[model samples]
Target: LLKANKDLISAGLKEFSVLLNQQVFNDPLVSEEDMVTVVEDWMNFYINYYRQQVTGEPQERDKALQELRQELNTLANPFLAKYRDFLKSHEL
Candidate 1:
């Protein structure tokens, strides 16, 4: 369990670093703190939403899932756009 937790945390941090390096946090509309919070919050929200789904209550789960998807999209679009440009330039 500990190893799995560490691996997940490391992966999350690595992904976070990639986003940071790509200037995802440099959006004019969001502060650095806000960007970090948004990422962390969405991650937690999705995890909980899925857990809720698996334990019955499909309707509530779906609503939470939709909210999570919307929030993730809002947070991810800018980073994805820049990442695509980065990949193209670097031939990644």
Candidate 2:
């Protein structure tokens, strides 16, 4: 079950990355490098969150999820901010 769940998350993440890349590439204002950075950051965030979950106390799983969300937010903020700016500049 654990393996299946992990595999599901991995597949979801890949789809998410593909969607993000398509959005970024479609936006005229966002460079290829910027899109790459966004994908890399997301992958890093997932890897780190998975690692954290492995070490988290069983009783603190909820706390771990919250922490993971916080971490992902932090990891995504800059990329999102830049993407928003690009959208604004390009009117996309």
Candidate 3:
């Protein structure tokens, strides 16, 4: 979603800072600080990650879902499978 630089931003950081103002950044199932940490860590992590089977790999599934909620109606999402398990866990 963003092109964050090594400093976690830069020119990219500035762009990412703007992203924080997006509606997606507004909703969080967790605390705002945790959400921020989740996204920020992911943004930085993607700098050098193996796209080798992401589902098996499992990163920030919950925060990812929340961000998508703020951005889209989400007929489907990358986290949807986990979300199904999520529903099951709560007796849905």
Candidate 4:
């Protein structure tokens, strides 16, 4: 339990790096490519992905998680407003 807890914390912090980096495009150099991969990597790698078939399901799946998933969707909204839109919309 201790190890599992620490692993989740570590991963969250790592993926949380981007939310700071992206920050509504203070990162002007942040590419469409970055916009593409960033949200999906964090969502699927740290928390969860949709469908749960090919790419594999999350270890920490729950209803509370849906809020964060939606949060990611909303956060990506700014990235979309700039460019990419649905191509940027991803959980996996």
- Quick one: best TM-score, which candidate? 4
Score each candidate by Cα lDDT. 0.53, 0.56, 0.38, 0.52
Cα lDDT tens digits for candidate 4, 1-92: 34544445444544564654445634334666675686677667645432232122354444335645665666666655655543365447
Clashes by residue pair, model 1:
none
TM-score of each: 0.34, 0.38, 0.25, 0.40
Poorest lDDT segment (10 consecutive residues) of candidate 1: 1-10
Could you arrange the candidates by TM-score from highest to lowest? Answer: 4, 2, 1, 3
10 residues in a row with least lDDT, candidate 2: 19-28
Provide the global lDDT of candidate 4 against the true structure: 0.52
Residue-level lDDT for 21 in candidate 1? 58
lDDT by residue (tens digit), candidate 1, 31-89: 44565576667567655645443433566556545655564566566665564554455
User: Which ranges in model 3 have alpha carbons more than 4 Å from their true place?
Assistant: 1-11, 23-28, 46-92
* 1 against 3, candidate with superior TM-score: 1
Q: Return the candidate ranking by lDDT, descending.
A: 2, 1, 4, 3
Model 2 regions lying over 4 Å from their true place: 24-75
Indicate the residue-level lDDT of 52 in model 3.
25
